[PDB]
Structure formats: C-alpha cells, structure tokens
Amino acid sequence: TCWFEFLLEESLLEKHLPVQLIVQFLEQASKPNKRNRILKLLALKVAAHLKWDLDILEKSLSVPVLNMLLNELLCISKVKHVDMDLATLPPTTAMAVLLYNRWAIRTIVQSSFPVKQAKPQMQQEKELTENILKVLKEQAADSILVLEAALKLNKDLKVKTEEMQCQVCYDLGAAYFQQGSTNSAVYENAREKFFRTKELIAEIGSLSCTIDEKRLAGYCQACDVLVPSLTPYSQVHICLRSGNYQEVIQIFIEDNLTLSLPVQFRQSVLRELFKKAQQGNEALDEICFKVCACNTVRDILEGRTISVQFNQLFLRPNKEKI
Amino acid sequence: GGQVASLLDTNRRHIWSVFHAGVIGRGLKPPKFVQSRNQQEVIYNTQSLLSLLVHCCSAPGGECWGAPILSPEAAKAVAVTLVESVCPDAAGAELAWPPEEHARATVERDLRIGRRFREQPLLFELLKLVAAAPPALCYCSVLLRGLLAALLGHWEASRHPDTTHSPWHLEASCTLVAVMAEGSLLPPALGNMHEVFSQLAPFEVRLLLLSVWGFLREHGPLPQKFIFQSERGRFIRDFSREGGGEGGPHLAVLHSVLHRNIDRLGLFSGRFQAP
Amino acid sequence: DSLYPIAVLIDELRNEDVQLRLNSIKKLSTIALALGVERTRSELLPFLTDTIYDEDEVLLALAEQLGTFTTLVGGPEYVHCLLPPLESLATVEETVVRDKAVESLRAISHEHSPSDLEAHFVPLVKRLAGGDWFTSRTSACGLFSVCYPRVSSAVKAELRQYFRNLCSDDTPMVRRAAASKLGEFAKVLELDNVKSEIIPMFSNLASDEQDSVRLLAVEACVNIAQLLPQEDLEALVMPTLRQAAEDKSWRVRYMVADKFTELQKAVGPEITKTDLVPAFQNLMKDCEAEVRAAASHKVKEFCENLSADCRENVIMSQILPCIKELVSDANQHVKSALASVIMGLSPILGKDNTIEHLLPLFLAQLKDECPEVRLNIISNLDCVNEVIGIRQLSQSLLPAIVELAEDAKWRVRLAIIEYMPLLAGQLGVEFFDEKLNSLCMAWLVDHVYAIREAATSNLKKLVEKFGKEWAHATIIPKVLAMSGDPNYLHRMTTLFCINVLSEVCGQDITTKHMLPTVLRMAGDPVANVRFNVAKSLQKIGPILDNSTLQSEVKPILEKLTQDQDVDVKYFAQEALTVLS
Amino acid sequence: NKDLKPQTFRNAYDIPRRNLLDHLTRMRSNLLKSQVHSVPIAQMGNYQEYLKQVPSPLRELGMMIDEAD
Amino acid sequence: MPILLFLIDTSASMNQRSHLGTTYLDTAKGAVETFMKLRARDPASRGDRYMLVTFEEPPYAIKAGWKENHATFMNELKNLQAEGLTTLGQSLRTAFDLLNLNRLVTGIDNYGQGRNPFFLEPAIIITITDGSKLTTTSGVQDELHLPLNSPLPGSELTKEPFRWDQRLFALVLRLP
Amino acid sequence: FTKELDQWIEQLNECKQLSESQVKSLCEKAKEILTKESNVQEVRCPVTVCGDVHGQFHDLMELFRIGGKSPDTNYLFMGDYVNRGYYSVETVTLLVALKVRYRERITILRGNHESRQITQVYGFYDECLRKYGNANVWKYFTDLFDYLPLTALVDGQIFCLHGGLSPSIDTLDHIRALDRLQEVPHEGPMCDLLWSDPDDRGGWGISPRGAGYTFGQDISETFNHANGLTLVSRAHQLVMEGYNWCHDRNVVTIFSAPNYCYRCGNQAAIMELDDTLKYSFLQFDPAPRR
Ligand SMILES: [Mn+2]
Ligand SMILES: [Mn+2]
C-alpha cells in the first residue's frame, strides 16, 4: 500500500488486524490541504489503535515525527501548558496533554543517554532534533510541574487512575534521576516516585500499563544506595559513609571466604582509604594496612599477584602486622 | 609471564610432471611456539622482583603501622626507563595530552605499546609500582596515552555486545583506569568507573575512556601540580584547586552511561557521587 | 480541493524522484479499484492523455498497466476507449514504447468485437498513418496486423490498400517498420490478395535504396515463400532471392546465409537444386568471412533435405570443391562454423566416399590452430563411428585423438573423454589397454576438475563394460597410488572414483579392495578429505557386504562425528543416520 | 642483479638446490614433445594492445577510473 | 615553446618521512605529478617539453634531455632513488648546461649584435629539495657555489650560468 | 534446517535469483557469521585463491568447473563480486550462500566495488532495481558488504588482499585493529587497502584512480620482511595472462574474470594452494555463451 491507496481507503486501517505506515503518512504530510488533514486523522486513528503505547511509538518513530504527531493531537483537542492547567478537563484532552508531557520527559531522558555513533536528510533531522531538544530543555520545568500537578489529580476511552498515575510518576522519578547527577537533593523526590511506582505496580499489575520491571528494580536499588532515608556492597558503602571501618575489615575477611564483592570494588575502596589516610587522619593507617592485607589474601586465593601496596607495607614489619 | 633429507624424500614422493608450478616460501609454516609455565611460579617471581624494586625505591626503614615513603625520584627512574624500554619516545612525548584526533596519527606506536603490554604482563606491575609514588606516573604519560589509544581503537572496532568477549582488553582498560586513579591522574569519581566496564558494551566503555582522555587534556598530568606537602614527606594532587576538579562534563557522561544501564548498574551508583 | 483522487494524488505522486514515479505509476490499478467503474471510464483516461512530461522511465510500465486493464474499464464494450491515450503514447520518439504499446493493444483485442474495431481500430490506423511524425506511422503499421481475422471484405480492402500506401512511403524508418510488419502480416493475408497487393510492394521494397529494407524483405521472403507453391513461386521470390544472393549489401548476404534451410524445405528439393545452387556455390567463396561463416552452418541440413536422386552427385560436384577452399581458409570463425556441421555428411555421403573424401578434411581440421574448430570436429564422432565402423576409425583418426587427449584446452579433452567409453565399447581389451588405458588413467590427475570428474564417469562405464577381472588388474592399483599423493585434490579423485566404481564392481570386491583405502583417509589432516570420506561411506554403504559395515565403517563414523570441523560433523552425522 | 635474464632451462648452474628435482622434471618434460607471466605492470592491463595482436571476430547484424572505462 | 626542467633532489636526506608516511622524494614525485596535472589544464600548454635532472653523477644526472618522449620522462621520474649527496651546486651547473647547450648552434644568444627579447628559448628550472645542508665527499659546503672546472664553450661571454629567459624556482619541502 | 540452503545453492547454480525475503534471511545469517571474522582472516591450506569476478556469473561457474565444486574445494575470493557484469546479483548471492552454508570452506574478502558509492555508480544498484524493483535488496547486500574481512592470511605466509598496501600501514596488527564495519573511505588505511596498485616504482605514488596509492618493489619487500610474509596475493587490476607476478615475486595479481567487461578478451586464472603451500595457476578462458 501507499499514502494514496490508504487515503482513498476508509477501511484499510480496519483490515490489517504500522509505525512504518505512520511515519510514511507523516513523511507524505511533512510538506504543508484536505489530504493533509485526512492523513493526520488516519495517523491519529492508527496510533490510537495501539492504545497509545509510547513504549512502542518512541522506539520506532523518531523524535521530530512524534513531536509533530502529538503537537497535531494537541491542536486537534486542546485550545503555556503550565499556566493553563485545568486538570479537571474532558478525558481526551486530559490524557492527550498527559501523554504529550510524558513524551517530553521521556525524550529528555533519552536524549541524555549516550547513543552508538554511526560509523558510516540526516543534517535536517539533526538540526530539527537539536532545536526541539533545546526548547524542551528551556521548558522542561513546565512539563515537570504539569505532570506533578496531574499526578495529584484523580478525577477520572477512560483509563484507570492507578496506571495513569504509575506511568507518569515513574517518568517524574526518571527525570529527577536525570537531574540528580547535578543536584543530589533531587534524588529524594525520585526515591518517593519510584517507591510509589513499585507499590502501585505490585498492587494492580496492569498491562496497558507495562513497565520494565528490571529497570524499576535497578532504579530502586540505585535510590536505596544513593539516598539512605542488606548485601555486603551496601553494607560497605554505609560503613564508609558513617566513618566506621572495623565492620569493613570484618566483611572483607568474610568476603575472602564467600568471594562475593568485586575485586575492582575492593581495590577501589582500598585506594579511597589510602587517599583519605593520605589527606590526614593518622587513625586510618592501621585501617589501610588491614584492608590491604584482606585484599592481598583475596588476591592470592584467586591466583593474582601481590600489589605494591602490600610489599611496601611490609617494609618495616611489625608483630601486630604479621 | 612474558610471551615467547630434502632431495631424497622429494625424489621418493615423485608423477612424471611436477604438477605444482612452485613452492611459496620455504614450504609449510612451522607449528608455532609452545608455552608451558606455572602461573603461581610467575606470581612469586614477580613478587621477588617487585619486592626488590620497592626495597630499592623506598627510603631506608614511631607509628607501629604504616609504610615508608617511596621515592618519587626512584619511581621516576623506573618510569623513564619503562618508557624507553616499551616505546623509545620523541614522536609525541610531551607530558601534555594531545587531542583525541591526534591518536589517529600515532596508531602504529599505540599498537606497539599495546602489544608490549599484552606480551609482558609485568609492565602493569611496574606501572602500579610507578603509580605508588604520586608525581612519577606523570613521566610515564606516553605509555598511558598509547595504551589508552590502543584500547579505544579496540573498543571502537568491537562488534561484540559485551566487554566479556575481550578479556585482556577489558582487564587492561580496568587496570589502566585504576593505575591513573592510584597515581592521582584522575579524581576519585572518575577513577572508580573500572567497576562498571565488565557490565557495559564496547561503545560506552569507549565513551568513558574518551572522557578520561578529555579530562587529561583539560587538567594535564604534570608534576608541577603535585605540591610537596611536608606534613608527611610526599607529594599530593588536590584537583579542587585546579577548578572543576570533580570533572563536570566527564562526570556527566559517566552518569548518563549509568542511567542508560540502570537495570544493572543500580548497585554501582554509589561509587560516583560528586560530593 | 485535494481530496479528489485522480489529479491531486497522481500528479503530486509523480512530482517525486524516479523510483517513486515508477511506484505511483504501478499503483494506478489501485486508484481504479477504489473508484467505481463509471468514474474511471469517464474521467481517468483524459489525465492519461494529459500532463505528458513523464520521461522514458514510466512509459513502458504505464503501457503494460493499460494493457492489463480488462474489467476495470467497463467491459468488452467500452475497452475500445483505451485506444486514444495509448496511441498518443505510441507517438514517443524512443522505441520500446511502440512495441510495448502495440503488444498491450493486441492483448485487449481479445475483448473486441468486429463492429467495435471496424468503428475505431481501422479509423485509428487511418489517422495514425496520416500523422506528421514517423513514430505514428511505425505504430500504425505495428497495430495494422490484428484486424484481418475479424473484419469483412469491404474493409479488408481498405486495410490492404492502406498497407499498400505504407509500403511506398519516403521517410526511412517507416519503411523499416512496414518492412518488418510485412513478414508478420504475410502469414495471415489471403493468397490472392497477397499476389495482388504485397508481391509488387515486396518486390520493389526488395530493391529499396536502403539496405535495411532489403534486409527485412529477406526476412519476409520465408513468410511469403512458405505458401503459393505453384509456378507463382517460380516467378515470385526468384528476383529478390537472386538479387540478394550476391548483393552488394553484406548484411543482406549475411541474413540470407542464416536462413537457407527453412526456405529450401519449404519450396521442395528439386527446385532449389535447379535454381539457387550457383548462388549457394558462389556464396561459400565470398569476399568476407562474415557471410562465409554464416552459410557454412547450413551444410548438413541443406544436404539432408536435398533430393536423393542426385544427392551424392550434387554434393561432390558443388559443395566439396568449395569446401576445400573453406577448410584451408585464413579465418578461424569460418572453419569453426564449418567443422560443427560438415562432419554430419558421413551417413549421407556413404562409407567409401567418406573414407576417400571426408577423412583428409577431418584430419586437416583436427590440426587446426583454433581450438574451437578442433572441438567442433570432435563434437559428433558417434555418427562417424556408426557409419564407418571401429576399424577404419581406429586406423585413420586414432593418432589425432591421442594428440588431442593432452591438448591445451580443457574443453577439447572433455569432449575426447565423452567418446572413450563409446570407442572402448567396440574395441578389444588388449589393444585398448596397451593404447588408451594409461591415457584414461592420465586424466584422473588433470588440473581441471571437469576433466577429472569427466573421466571418473568414463571409468565407471568401462568397468560396467569390461568387468572387475580387468579393473583389478589395471585400474585399481594405479588409483591407490594416486590415493597417497600429498595433493588433496588427488585424494578427492581417489574418493570420487571409489564412489563411482563401487556401484559396478562387487560387494566383496569393494569390501576387500576399496574399503581399507577409505579407512586410511579418515585420519587425514584436511577436513575436505574427511567429510568426503564420510560422504563416500554414505554412498558406498548400501553396496558392500553388510557384515563389514558395522564392523569397520561404524567406528570411524563414530570418530568422524566428533571431528573438530562442523562440516565433517554434519556429513558424518548424516551418513550415520542414513546407514542405519 | 635483478632482471639479469636467468637461463635456468639453458644453464644448470642457475638451479637452486632446493628447487632442483622439480625443475629437473619440468625441463625434462619441456625438452620432450610436451619466468613466463612476469610482464611489467604498465603493460599488463593493455586491452587495446592485446586486441590489436588478436584476430577480429564476426561483425554484428568520487574516484577517477576503474579500468575499461 | 616552453621547457620545464625538474631538478629533483635525490640526496639521501630526501628519504625523510613526512607525517603522510611518505618520504620527501615521494612527495617530490607527487608534486611533479600535481604540477603536470595543473599545467595540462591550460590548453595553450599542450605544446610543452619536460626535462628531468637529478643530483647524481654527471653521466647519470640527466634522465630526460632533448628528444626524449614524455613516456620516458614519466618512467624515469617514477623510478628515482634517493641515494646520493646534496651536490646541489653541481646539479645546478649541469641543469643550466643542459638548457644552454643548444643556444650557440642556433644562435638565440646574439653576442655583440644586441639582446633580442624576441629571440628566446623559454624555460624554468624547478628544484624540489629539502632544507638540509649541502654535502660533498669532503664535508658540508654551507653555501651554494657553482663549479667552473669544465666550462662549456662560450660560457665566458655570459659570466653567469643562468641565461636571460631561464628562471629558477625551489620547492624546499619542510613537511615535519 | 539447512536443506533450504542447499536448495538455494542449487537454484542459484541455474542462474535463478532468490526472492527478497530469501535474500534477507541469507543476509542476516551472513552478517551473523561475518561479525565473528577478523580483518585478517587466517585461512588453512589447501585453498584456491580467486581474483575479481565482477558479475560474470557464467565465468564463475567456469571457475567452479576448473577448480571444483565449492564444498570440495576450499575457495578464497578477493573482493569485487559485483558491477561490470550482467549477473552481479546472482554471483554475489551464490558467494554469500556458499559462505553461509560452508563458512569454513570458503572465504570472501572485500574489494573496492563493495561500497555504496561504487555500487550506485557502476551498476550493481541498477541491476538490483531491474531484478527486484526495489533497492531493498541492494541495501541488504551493501549492509552485508561492511562485514566482509578486508584481508586474508594463508598459513601465516601468503597475504591475500584485494587492493594493495598503504603508507599508513606497516604491520598486519594495524589491519587487525581497523574498524572495518563502515563505508570504504576516500582516504586512510582501509581505502588504500582496497584501492592500491603495485607498480614499477620507487616509493609510494598518487594513484591514477582517485583513491589509494601506488607502491614499488622496495615497499612490498619491506612489508613482506616486516610482517614475515612470503607473498602478497592481489586481485585489484586487470591481467591479460590471468595472473602476473610483480615485484620480484613478492606480489602476484590474480584475475578471475575472463573477458572482463565482455570486451577485454582477457584470460583468467585461479591460484591453487595445496597441503605443502605449493602454488599452481590454472588459466581458464570464458565459458561458451550464445
Ligand atoms: Mn579493473
Ligand atoms: Mn578492484
């Protein structure tokens, strides 16, 4: 099929019982007529045929085509977004602004990610994506307030308030985690949103919505490690944060038996302890020797070489060291 | 642990025509080299050599714990002879790190350094020995740059989806970033990301190593920055005074890599806090 | 504004690059399916007549799509309305539009009624030929032919006289087009009307000032000569044939020289014997090698279709005196064209005449420098063997065969191998063994793999003829000598001949001479040898004695199925499963 | 001295010892009724020159170059 | 009727590699290729004869003189080897000797009858070299001196080897 | 689930092309296989080494008739399986099908014509459009071309390679370190690797083509001595005798496309290697067509 055979067909979308077809509709309608409006209506209809699943639209349809799609949707139903609000709105124009701002947050999060550079038209798409990402960076706070205010509202193809809140609150927590790299206090809000998402997902278990369980689990683990408000890794982390090192030595001696912690983690904490003793705190010298000895036994049991730190610590050997 | 009659028989094998029009080279290639050596014996030979070097480097042997100060002059001597042995320098040998695109002009030298590191495993041991004295690792910056360029080239040219299919290169990348961190050519936040290298794919570890290169261009592994703090008798680098000592953009790209793979790097998120 | 299907969709779809124009043109069927039949039949065809800026990319596809329209136009009654835009399309200067358009128009004539085509098709030919452009007249003569089986005499006369006008035009390319359509039209017109109209036009276009029109008159000579077989023919095709025989136009002499056989069969033997044999005689000694090589293909058929009353007399009186000059010619292509067919005269000429005359010619062409001539000589020696017998063939031609058994070209050696079981089928074991058995064994170590597999089959046929009592004596030990060669392709040949001979040797014979050699190669360091061993055991599995099968063959296939190369693993597993 | 025109088939002293038996077989066969292909690269893809020294057949009825236009 | 004499330095210092990985002699030959590519663009430059001189000994110095076809010039340029000393003065003397060889027999140089701008044999010498110091068997000459041991007949009437219509250009390759 | 591959090989041997989905599945399987291959693919003797084929499918079947069927004879193909031929699709599909089916028994390297620009200009794209109507087959094949190895190494001695050497490359370890999964650039190591031509030269030289370099005997001598090679098998240029030794038998140019653009009248050749690395060249004339 094509854009013309689909334009005359009022039932072709009702027969194929797609995203490539949607981007074909947008590409033909990319240039500015009644054919344009018909193409937008068909694209919106077939997009709505998927129950508005941004988890399938985001991956295939690129950022500018999806931007055009939901901008056309907002032109269709609605009429800044932060100053307008009016969350007690008709269903369609509620979930439309909801989905648009969820998309806004999701693409900000996705744009922050690193993509694989293509080793081997592209310039126009790059410029357009850069421009829309720039204006999104300008107005990301408005979207955050809109989604946050909407999450506080539970007035209401109506969708369940539980799933409509869990998806958006997950997006809020992801956005805060994106900004958590800059302002560490932002992580607390991400923690609360993520715990709400975990509780809601465990409660209802909705499917349409569907969330990556592994991503949510890793998000919750990261928030637990970062903001405190257990496995030996987190035990070592809190012990280092609280200034207690004897339990670090004991859990390292136990780790020599279990072989649980990464060797890289042990070498890094040994280096951090050496750096802190280097900075001051003469009370750390025995702690540095103790964890160095623990790492050395871990290394010999794993069949790896003895470090330079151990060898220089055994210059001037002492009874207690031995 | 380093790496590495005629006419009578010919007449007998003859049939009234030669058939083959020649013999390429001297015939068949040999069955290649063979290696058989104990790993533990290698470990303890390395231990005896490294203990001797630490004895030679340290000052002659108060607090009943702690260690003597390794001489930065002795470790500087070890570093400069390591540089001379592995790559006789003066193509690019200034301590300043050049732009990343300059690595595409010295690629033969970087591959030579990479092969030397691969063949002779104790080059990493002597590298850590150099790193034990802080300012001495600056004088070995050519080796660090060359090995980093070789590893970046490998990760860019890796079609595998995980770093586990490149065991030596994974270990070399981990060891190289750990050695820079130990020598304080990186801040503790940037020097901790050898934990995650086993979890990532080649392109993000390539990005993180490029962030190492960018940070070293921005700050520079120079010995003049290592101020002599005489409270103990050894050199100190404090990146905070240099401005952006946390490595702002480099921390940003590392946190983006973490957030991409948050499903598996959740537990490691605590090793990269800027405060 | 833009919701209207035809203009708004099709023009804005055709405004894109070339491949999208081809796609959108191909989707013109769909725009007819979506709309009702009356709307398309009343609107769609005008815009096909309009916006003529489509470039050469889409015109053939558009013509084909108009051709496949058979129901979406309205039916057989309205299908005549595909005549105007397709005809206007036929006025395009490039060529492929014209033949593709007329092919489309001929197809939709199946739905056409007499009255329908009398009302539109014949006026279309009228206005088409009347056009001021040569393309219109070429399409006019192209579309001319399909009206005769449906029209009546009253407009048959109009068709005939308008065709007559089309013969005597002035611009050259319409003369070429009409000349081409004469031969296609000559097969359908009434013979009396053909005499009345076409023969004056065919004759005076055979003398046209343009060599192309003479060429196509030569083309239409057969289609105008396959009928009218009374004295008519004697005074019909004669002038043009005798003029074209030795014509100054080298191309006309070429294309006559490639068509004599069908003409000669169509007009009886004795008549050609009487009339065109000076032309045939002098054609073989022509100035250029082109026509000389063209005519030399037609010796066998011209002789075989001739009259037996004087066949040998006419052949030895006219063909051989010029065949002597042809054989000793300086052109390789002429001799190559000769050698492919002139050796088929051995049944026709007889046995004694063949030995007395044809054999020196065959030996002369066997020593020819050009290897294609040698290959063509070897091509059909079975007929010579049948009509001469093994005796004289082995007496005269055998040393030439020995010389070409080790020729530079591999194709010649391949040809020689094909007749070795044939000759050995009629020869004695002793003489064959001393003379050619070593020669047959010399081919299994040839460089080319075609030669190798060629004489593997030869060895199979020989063992099928002679028997194991001789294969053991001669073939097998020298094969086993070749089994130990360092060159792995020689071991391949050992495995292949083991495969082919085992089928025709004997179960005990295979199990006690073929099997241990195959058992040896299972330890070869080359994976090719090992998987070929697995495949060979699979092939010879149901041939040898079943007791030795699980006793000896099974353990190595249990070893081969754990070979490090996946290819040998797969082949050994398949052999294990099918052996059962 | 390269391109000194070795006379291996005319001089047995040019034969290497390792390449003696096979060369012996070759030049034994060559003497009976039954080096080359080392042309300079410049005159290696010359198709005009090659076709000039070949008989005629019967007549009919980004980057810069990639050879044969 | 122009003449384009190339005085390609073939001293062994031309074996220095640039960052391109090619020796200075390789870029020198490539610069000659680029020069004739650019020169052939002018359609009035069709009639033009190239010459080649190197730094070798006098029998071997000249590799394309007069009455040598362009194919021989190309073949000789491609096969040059940098194996000599930087005998730049001697090579310049033999380059000017090549150009001023035919001046007396055809009498373009009118001695005592006035200097005729309309009687000329145009030519330019392009010497592609490096900045390396001059070298002879004795040592480093450190200054360009032109030998006068074996004067061409009639060289006493001009007092300088270079003539009216001859100009010298240098491509001193300093590629690091 | 490999009988369909044998049926495709049999189907292609009759010059019948595969469908678009067949070509798609073939290209996915081939991409999966070729991703594992290094840039310098080590090849074990025996092996038959072939040069340019350039779309002449019937000449490729002639090559098979000369050297043997593909599972039975190990083959090495040094690039240029497309363009300048009437059956580029059929020959490249047959080579990819044999690579998929018999991955250890046939090696296919990358030539200079295995690039998007060269295929678009010189007519592999046009052939794909003629035989399929859409460029998706051409897109599939060109995306497959990035995965082909650049070079091959036979027993660590012979160094099969389509084009020639590069001034930027001195060791095989540089070639192994190349990121070959990309378009053939207009400069740099991979470009000169697929585009360079030996010559009776001194050092390097700018190529008459727009890419690569041209190198003399001393260059290839240094390359062979540095990398511990005896020979640099090569396939990029046209050869009249089928094969031609170059540079004091350090470089040999094998051409396997007889009557190259159906007009050159050139003879072809393939170089066989056997268990003792003894080379024999089989010259073959073009197959008899109409
Ligand atoms: Mn070519
Ligand atoms: Mn090529």
Pick among A3, A6, A8, A31 to test the C interface (most C CBs inside 10 A)? A8
Collect all residues of chain F within an 8 Å Cβ-Cβ radius of residue E16: none
F236 annotated to a ligand binding site: yes
Q: Which one, of B70, B194, B61, B68, lies nearest residue B132 by Cα?
A: B70
Can you count the helices (H) and strands (E) in chain D?
2, 0
Q: Which of F113, F174, F186, F247 does the annotation list as catalytic?
A: F113
Q: Does B20 touch chain C (CB under 8 A)?
A: yes
What is the SS3 assignment for E168? strand
H-type alpha helices, C367-487: 371-378, 381-388, 390-396, 398-404, 410-424, 429-432, 438-442, 449-465, 468-470, 476-483
Please, which residues have CB within 8 angstroms of residue A83's CB and are 6 or more apart in sequence? Answer: none
CA distance A63 to A115: 14
CB pairs under 8 A between C and D: 12
Q: Which amino acid, residue F131?
A: K
CA angle B227, B231, B234 (to 5 degrees): 50
**Hey, what are C144's tokens?**
């001319």
Q: Does F188 touch chain A (CB under 8 A)?
A: no
The pair of structure tokens assigned to A70 is 């939901």
A305, A310, A314, A320: which to substitute to probe chain B, counting the most B Cβ within 10 Å?
A: A305
Distance D66 CA to ligand 1 centre (A): 5
Chain F environment of E25 (Cβ under 8 Å): 202-203
**Measured in angstroms, how far is the CA atom of residue F80 from the centroid of ligand 2?**
6
Surrounding ion ligand 1 within 5 Å at CB are: D 67; F 238
Chain F touching partners, 3 or more CB pairs below 8 A? A, B, C, D, E
| Cβ(A187)–Cβ(A177) below 8 Å | yes
DSSP bridge partners of B266: none
Q: What tokens were used for F118?
A: 């060269």
Q: Which C residues 349-408 touch A at CB under 8 Å? A: none
Residue B261 vs residues A188, B250, C378, F33: alpha-carbon distances, Å: 20, 17, 74, 28
Q: Do A33 and C2 touch (CB under 8 A)?
A: yes
Per the CB < 8 A criterion, the answer to whether D50 and F257 are in contact is no
Three-state DSSP at A300 gives: helix
Q: Which residues of C264-301 are buried (b: 16+ CB within 10 A; e: fewer)?
A: bbbbebeebbeebbebbeebbebeebbbbbbbbbbbbb
DSSP designation for F212:
S
Could you give the CA distance from residue F110 to residue F243 in angstroms, rounded to a whole number?
Answer: 20
Name chain D's partners: 3 or more CB pairs within 8 A. B, C, F
* F51-81: burial string, b at 16+ Cβ within 10 Å, e else: bbbbbbbbbbbbbbbbbbebbbbbbbbbbbb
Residue E111's nearest CA partner among E168, E151, E163, E149 is: E163
Q: Which of F3, F66, F72 would you mutate first to test chain C, the one with the most C CBs within 10 A?
A: F72
Whole-number Å distance between alpha carbons of A274 and C187: 105
DSSP string, C346-373: HHHH-SHHIIIIIHHHHHHHHT-SSHHH
Alpha-helical regions (H) of chain A: 3-8, 19-28, 34-48, 54-60, 63-77, 81-84, 91-112, 122-138, 140-151, 161-180, 187-204, 213-226, 232-241, 246-258, 263-279, 285-301, 308-313
Ligand 2 center from residue F147 Cα (angstroms): 18
Q: Position of tokens 């070995």?
A: B140
Annotation-wise, does F112 bind a ligand?
A: yes
Residue type at C110 in one-letter notation? H
Is residue D34 less than 8 Å (CB to CB) from chain C?
A: yes
- Rounded to whole angstroms, how far apart are CA atoms A293 and A322? 10
SS percent in chain B: helix, strand, coil, step 5: 55, 5, 40
DSSP reduced 3-state for F48: strand
Say whether F186 counts as a known binding-site residue.
no
Which residue of F lies nearest to C564 if distances are taken between CA atoms? Answer: F104
With a CB cutoff of 8 Å and minimum separation 6, the contacts of C12 are: none
| Cβ proximity of A240 and A284 under 8 Å | no
Q: Please answer whether residues A76 and A68 qualify as being in contact, where contact means their C-beta atoms are separated by less than 8 angstroms.
A: no
D30 touches chain B (CB under 8 A): no
Chain B nearest-CA residue for D24: B18
Q: Are F267 and F242 in contact (CB under 8 A)?
A: yes
Nearest-CA distance from E129 to chain F in Å? 16
Q: What is the spatial distance between Cα E158 and Cα E99, in angstroms, rounded to a whole number?
A: 14
Tell me if C114 sits within 8 A of C154, measured CB to CB: no
Q: CB-based contact (8 Å) between F220 and chain C?
A: no
Distance CA(B173)–CA(F44), nearest Å, equals 33
Q: Are A180 and A186 in contact (CB under 8 A)?
A: yes
Decide if E83 touches F, using CB distance below 8 A.
Answer: no
State whether residue F234 is helix, strand or coil.
strand
The minimum CA-CA distance between B24 and chain D, rounded to whole Å, is 11
CA dihedral B252, B254, B260, B263 (to 10 degrees): -130
For residue C510, give both structure tokens: 């295979």
Instruction: Look up F174 and say whether it is catalytic.
Output: no
SS3 state of residue C418:
helix
- Residues C553, C537: contact at Cβ < 8 Å? yes
Distance F255 CA to ligand 2 centre (A): 10
DSSP C198: I
- Rg of chain E over all Cα atoms, to the nearest angstrom: 17
Question: What is the CA(F237)–ligand 1 centre distance, in A?
Answer: 5
Structure tokens at B95: 């301590």
Q: Tell me: is residue F266 an annotated ligand-binding position.
A: no
Question: DSSP characters for C2-37?
Answer: ---IIIIIHHHHHTS-HHHHHHHHHTHHHHHHHS-H
Give the span between the Cα atoms of A117 and C307, in whole angstroms.
82
The two structure tokens encoding residue C78: 């309205």
F241–D47 C-beta distance less than 8 A? no
Distance CA B234, CA A30 (A): 66
Q: Between the CA of residue D9 and those of D30, D32, F243, what are the distances in Å?
A: 9, 13, 22
- Does C212 lie at the interface with D, CB-CB under 8 angstroms? no
Asked if E124 and E166 touch (Cβ cutoff 8 Å), the reply is: yes
First to last CA, chain D: 38
Stated as kind and residue range, the H or E segment containing C262 is helix C260-266
- Which tokens sit at C141? 């003569």
| Residue B35 to chain D, least CA–CA distance (Å) | 32
CA D69 to CA D52: how far, in whole Å?
A: 18
Distance CA A63, CA A70 (A): 11
Contact between B103 and B149 under an 8 Å Cβ cutoff? The reply is: yes
Q: Let me know: does F198 contact F247? Beta carbons within 8 Å.
A: yes
Q: Are F77 and F106 in contact (CB under 8 A)?
A: yes
Residue given tokens 């007529």 in the structure block: A33
List strands edge to edge, sheet with F251-254.
F40-43, F151-154, F158-161, F232-234, F251-254, F243-246
